[PDB]
Specification:
Elements: E1 4-10, E2 14-21, E3 27-34, H1 40-72, H2 87-93, H3 101-113, H4 133-144, H5 149-158, H6 172-187, H7 196-204, H8 225-228, E4 245-246, H9 250-261, H10 276-287, H11 326-332, H12 338-341, H13 344-356, H14 362-368, H15 376-382, E5 391-392, H16 396-406, H17 414-419, H18 447-467, E6 472-476, H19 483-491, H20 505-508, H21 516-519, H22 521-528, H23 542-547, E7 552-556, E8 571-575, H24 576-579, H25 587-590, H26 600-610, H27 619-624, H28 635-639, H29 650-665, E9 671-675, H30 677-686, H31 699-713, H32 721-728, H33 746-752, H34 760-763, E10 769-772, E11 788-792, E12 798-805, H35 816-819, H36 827-830, H37 833-845, H38 852-860, E13 878-885, E14 890-891, E15 903-905, E16 910-918, E17 921-928, E18 932-935, E19 938-941, H39 943-951, E20 960-965, E21 970-973, E22 976-985, E23 990-994, H40 1000-1007, E24 1015-1018, E25 1026-1031, E26 1037-1039
Parallel strand pairs: 1-6, 3-10, 6-9
Antiparallel strand pairs: 1-2, 2-3, 4-5, 7-8, 11-12, 11-15, 12-13, 14-15, 16-17, 16-20, 18-19, 21-22, 21-25, 22-23, 23-24, 25-26
The structure holds magnesium ion (3 copies).
The protein binds three DNA and RNA strands through helix 1, helix 2, helix 3, helix 4 and helix 9.
PDB class: dna binding protein/rna/dna
Keywords: CRISPR-Cas9, genome editing, DNA cleavage, DNA binding protein
Assembly: tetrameric
Length: 1052
RNA sequence: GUACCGCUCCAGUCGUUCAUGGUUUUAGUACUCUGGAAACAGAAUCUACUAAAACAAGGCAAAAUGCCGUGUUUAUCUCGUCAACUUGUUGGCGAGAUUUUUUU
DNA sequence: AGAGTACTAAAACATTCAACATGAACGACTGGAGCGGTAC
DNA sequence: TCGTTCATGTTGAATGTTTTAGTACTCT
């Protein structure tokens, strides 16, 4: 062990470490660890698929009920035709006349698949003909107005023809009504007498509520109802063993009232604050009697001036009004009976019950369970109170230990808790050696920063074990990046003084009011965009946004599928007339179109004048508003990831206090500080590094080691005294602060914060150590979901049949690739030649356009017609056509019966592989992600597929095992070291891998090359030396000589 | 400045609760072709729109208002460090075997 | 013996082509922001 | 922004073409 100081950096991709000597400021270690980058969309998807899982699992339950009761009353059997009966006619012809067994079964099954929305039971409004479900249910109701959904559906069938899509969202109770209609019609047609009418709708109205929870086995739920009504909330602060209590508990409201009474200001010739008798008269004459105690009605009990009482809290309206004894009146306004309202404890219990539930029937039972003096008559009324949810941060037994004396003295709350020697949550670990992971859970916001943080504990404990205890820790974060840059943007403004600074400050500092944290982005974008729409540059006044909302709409910039950003960076304010026509179109493509008000260049200069001054657009948002390359692909869908930013303050302080507690208990006078990225931005600015981004994973270290020296900067100059106090949060002596030096202006930064002799070891360091996370977890993303179909032809190969949908669009240019390249592929090239000629007419008459079909629509007002005798065919939007011969796939024709030709999924995902050495040739075996079996709490690599993956490679029994490789290992291949990405192709023995020192894309732009950045290598007899090297938690290099292929999978 | 209360609103997360849709196969009717003089017959087989009926390989539990599959090991292999699962393996601790050569 | 011809079988360097989707509602927690204030 | 000053960009599978060696004939 030697004396060392640590410097950490963290980002949603990686962790970066820099270890410097404490004595002579010499760096000893510098490197970066990588791990599987996490985004909220990941766990959100794991949600959404679980959601859909239950959706299907109950859709099948709704199948089960109808199935069994069809079997029951002699209605259905496994001998009759099930397909070919139209339910649209079924449910309407069931309005008056007979329905057959199988037809009735079809109608009932269809109305079981369909249930409609509950949370809009009683919507009555007009419609703007948008895509939302409320307005469409409004249309459905206004179109029925006497009829049932059956009639509208069947009419839209017989007349127009298309009968699904966005226009089948209907009010649920309408389905319920037509359910009664058809059930009672079929009542007197078969062996159905009384029971059959009920149980369906009873079951067809079943639903799980947003608080029933998932099933029993849930690793996220609860075994009992009342359990999570004791788990969701927090605990007491000063008594971290007993639960909190509700926001509107009666004695809690007494607490708040006494707070507002014991903080008052009186300018009379007596005691400054109220006496005990004065307060008691107040509580029994004003608060208990009137809902909102008016200041005009409070002075009459103490005989003081009506307008000399101050020092209290206000109500929601922003007017001075005291904390209402909300439950007291509300029970009084319906119950004057005195046996209960004179009991504080049962009233507290009533408040707690009213809060910790929201059901209108559970509160009834839980009030009957309070064995009070009430009757049914009152409880049926009291159970329907509203607005009494929310918990308050203390408990009963912290209120009691302060209530009694609060009667008497005139102090203010927390002081009493200090007199009784009550201390908030402070963890003790004075007996431990390394930093634990037990204290993590309380200090966590979301899984993203959870992953980004929890491994700093692992790395620092490893550094302690290998290095002893350090002397200082300095930490930079991924969420502390715009403190001081924004502060100087607020304060510096312009040097011209006077006219410039005294006018636009109302937009620079936003008038210096708290309104900035109440307007939200829907009004912030008005300030951000000069009060002008981005896509039109028309006026968007602040008074019109607050008095005419309907003129302008707030929406995102880029769809989630290629942006995944739900923050204040990916949203804009656009006039309703333009926003309604947007959808899947950004400013680049939207404003360059044939009916746009402006060009891309005028908008570009608009953004530039919005992004070249005070309050400029952030480069992350600037790239959103200019578009790069093309949005219609996946290449930008990944490049939009690594520029994004978020701001938070809880996540920093969580681990900050976690480190301080542990370092204070074990008697470790170790400085621990976190720096915002604002200061380090200036540091990187003024330290004169090379003008290049082709550095890769080393950035995270080269930046982090910056921080590792920044702390030492605090011990070289004497202008940092106030800066030292601020970065340590040190209290300023009242007669000292005005002369304490801090660094705020650029001249001070250049005189003080520039150390060229202490940065030659950070900029020029090129000896990093890398190590990647072996994501050995089983059960990950196996295989994609877009099923694919396959046909047979003359040669005898199987062919993927691709599909082309949405022919009507103006901007679908893909069709040129069929006729003008090779029309042989299309199926209608061989079959239906007459329709082929029909198509060929349009194809040839518009051979010099973008989309010949949209040209046809312009020139004839109607799209192409399905070819037939009379040429009056439905519009064409979809085309099947021939694709590729298929070798490496997943034969999945097992599930569909009767398939005249096989069906395949696509794009298997490799998990690991295995090198073997037969005499002088290395051969591969691949363990896919499909090669895992679940047993109890562990996962076994099914060796059958494994040994079938070595025989088919023709691997000798005498072949010499080298290593099994997991993801992102270090493979020694004949001239280099590489990271497993995966086995690109097993049959070809083509494998895809990547560089270690830098991103190989970024390596290509290091050479400015043009081939795809895929390190793909084919394995054959030409192999000479394949070995395993590996790296430790810091990233240092070694080799492993393990003897056997890993067979068992470690969990955890 | 931190912990501290109560009000108000806002955002996010977790976690839960939904409806509508999307992709591939039979009966189709608008289809393709054959035979046939055509009639007509069948068989195919491109576009559509409905009946039906399945969506990460699996594991379960077995009719129950059922769940998990994009959350952690940790650099691998030795050495022991003893104890509990008990064929093993676990659980930890530490040192090595591993990163410049002279070295007590 | 040594190489062009002509083909033939096979292996590297690169190209091209696919990815399941909307509208809602609510408990907690968390934090954010405005109101005042006591200890430490 | 006179300024490298919040800071990079997929995973799999199937083709097209390009590169070379081998073989046998035939030429010298
Ligand atoms: Mg940073
Ligand atoms: Mg929209
Ligand atoms: Mg960085």
């Amino acid at each position: 062990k030697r004396n060392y100081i640590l410097g950490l950096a963290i980002g949603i991709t990686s962790v970066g470490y820099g270890i410097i000597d404490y004595e002579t400021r010499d760096v000893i270690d510098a490197g970066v660890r990588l791990f599987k980058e996490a985004n909220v969309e990941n766990n959100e998807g794991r949600r959404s698929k679980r959601g859909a899982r239950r959706l299907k699992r109950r859709r099948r339950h709704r199948i089960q009920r109808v199935k069994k009761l069809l079997f029951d009353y002699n209605l259905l059997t496994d001998h009759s035709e099930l397909s070919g009966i139209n339910p649209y006619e079924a449910r309407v012809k069931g309005l008056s006349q007979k329905l057959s067994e199988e037809e009735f079964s079809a109608a009932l099954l269809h109305l079981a698949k369909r249930r409609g929305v509950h949370n809009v039971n009683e919507v009555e409004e007009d419609t703007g003909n948008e895509l939302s479900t409320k307005e469409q249910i409004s249309r459905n109701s206004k179109a029925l107005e006497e009829k049932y959904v059956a009639e509208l559906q069947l009419e839209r069938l017989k007349k127009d023809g298309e009968v699904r899509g966005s226009i089948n969202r209907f009010k649920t109770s309408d389905y319920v009504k037509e359910a009664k209609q058809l059930l009672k019609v079929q009542k007197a047609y078969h062996q159905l007498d009384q029971s059959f009418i009920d149980t369906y709708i009873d079951l067809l109205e079943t639903r799980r509520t947003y608080y029933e929870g998932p099933g029993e086995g849930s690793p996220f739920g609860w075994k009992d109802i009342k359990e999570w009504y004791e788990m969701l909330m927090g605990h007491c602060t000063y008594f971290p063993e007993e639960l909190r209590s509700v926001k509107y508990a009666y004695n809690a409201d007494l607490y708040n009232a006494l707070n507002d009474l014991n903080n008052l200001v009186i300018t009379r010739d007596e005691n400054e604050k109220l006496e005990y008798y004065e307060k008691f008269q107040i509580i029994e004459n004003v608060f208990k009697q009137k809902k909102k105690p008016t200041l005009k009605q409070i002075a009459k009990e103490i005989l003081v001036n009506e307008e000399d009482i101050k020092g209290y809290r206000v109500t929601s309206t922003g007017k001075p009004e005291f904390t209402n004894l909300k439950v007291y009146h509300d029970i009084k306004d319906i119950t004057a009976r005195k046996e209960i309202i004179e009991n504080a404890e049962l009233l507290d219990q009533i408040a707690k019950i009213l809060t910790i539930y929201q059901s209108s029937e559970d509160i009834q039972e839980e009030l009957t369970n309070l064995n009070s003096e009430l009757t049914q008559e009152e409880i049926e009324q009291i159970s329907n109170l509203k607005g009494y949810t929310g918990t308050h941060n203390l408990s009963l037994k912290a209120i009691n230990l302060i209530l009694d004396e609060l009667w008497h003295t005139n102090d203010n709350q927390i002081a009493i808790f200090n007199r009784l020697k009550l201390v908030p949550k402070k963890v003790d670990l004075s007996q431990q050696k390394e930093i634990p992971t037990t204290l993590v859970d309380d200090f966590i916001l979301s899984p993203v920063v959870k992953r980004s943080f929890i491994q700093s504990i692992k790395v620092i404990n490893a550094i302690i074990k290998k290095y002893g205890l350090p002397n200082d820790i300095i930490i930079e974060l991924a969420r502390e990046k715009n403190s001081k840059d924004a502060q100087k943007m607020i304060n510096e403004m312009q040097k011209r003084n006077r006219q410039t600074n005294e006018r636009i400050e109302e937009i620079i500092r936003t008038t210096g009011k708290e309104n900035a944290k109440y307007l939200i982005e829907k009004i912030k974008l008005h300030d951000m965009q000069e009060g002008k729409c981005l896509y039109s540059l028309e006026a968007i006044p602040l008074e019109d946004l607050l008095n005419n909302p309907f003129n302008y709409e707030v929406d995102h910039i880029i769809p989630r599928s290629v942006s995944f950003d739900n923050s204040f960076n990916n949203k804009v304010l656009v006039k309703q007339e333009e926003a309604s026509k947007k959808g899947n179109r950004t400013p680049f493509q939207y404003l360059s179109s044939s009916d746009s008000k402006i060009s891309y260049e005028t908008f570009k200069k608009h953004i530039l004048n919005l992004a070249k001054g005070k309050g400029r657009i952030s480069k992350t948002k600037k790239e959103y508003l200019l578009e790069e390359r093309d949005i219609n692909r996946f290449s930008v869908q990944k490049d939009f990831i690594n520029r994004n930013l978020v701001d938070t303050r809880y996540a920093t302080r969580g681990l900050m206090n976690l480190l301080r507690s542990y370092f204070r208990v074990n008697n470790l006078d170790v400085k621990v500080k976190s720096i915002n990225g604002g200061f380090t931005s200036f540091l990187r600015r003024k330290w004169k590094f090379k003008k290049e981004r082709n550095k890769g994973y080393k950035h995270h270290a080269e930046d982090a080691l910056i921080i590792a020296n920044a702390d030492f900067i605090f011990k070289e100059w004497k202008k940092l005294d106030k800066a030292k106090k601020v970065m340590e949060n040190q209290m300023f002596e009242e007669k000292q602060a005005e002369s304490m030096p801090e660094i705020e202006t650029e001249q001070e930064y250049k005189e003080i914060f520039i150390t060229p002799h202490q940065i030659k070891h950070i900029k020029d360091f090129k000896d990093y150590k890398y190590s990647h996370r072996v994501d050995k977890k089983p059960n990950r993303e196996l295989i994609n979901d877009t099923l694919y179909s396959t046909r047979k032809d003359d040669k005898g190969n199987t062919l993927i049949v691709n599909n082309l949908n949405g022919l009507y669009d103006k901007d679908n240019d893909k069709l040129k690739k069929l006729i003008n390249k090779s029309p042989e592929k299309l199926l209608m090239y061989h079959h239906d030649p007459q329709t082929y000629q029909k198509l060929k007419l349009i194809m040839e008459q518009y051979g010099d356009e973008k989309n010949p079909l949209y040209k046809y629509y312009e020139e004839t007002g109607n799209y192409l017609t399905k070819y037939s005798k009379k040429d009056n065919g439905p519009v064409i939007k979809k085309i099947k056509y021939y694709g590729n011969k298929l070798n490496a796939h997943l034969d999945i024709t097992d599930d569909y019966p009767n398939s005249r030709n096989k069906v395949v999924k696509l794009s298997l995902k490799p998990y690991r592989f295995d090198v073997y050495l037969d005499n002088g040739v290395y051969k591969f075996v691949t363990v896919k992600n499909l090669d895992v079996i679940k047993k109890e709490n562990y996962y076994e690599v099914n060796s059958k597929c494994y040994e079938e993956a070595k025989k088919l490679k023709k691997i000798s029994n005498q072949a010499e095992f080298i290593a099994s490789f997991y993801n992102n290992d270090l493979i020694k291949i004949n001239g280099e070291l590489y990271r497993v990405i995966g086995v690109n192709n097993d049959l070809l023995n083509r494998i895809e891998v990547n560089m270690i020192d830098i991103t190989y894309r970024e390596y290509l732009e290091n050479m400015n090359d043009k081939r795809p950045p895929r390190i793909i290598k084919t394995i054959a007899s030409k192999t000479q030396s394949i070995k395993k090297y590996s790296t430790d938690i810091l990233g240092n290099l070694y080799e492993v000589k393990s003897k056997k292929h890993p067979q068992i999978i470690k969990k955890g």
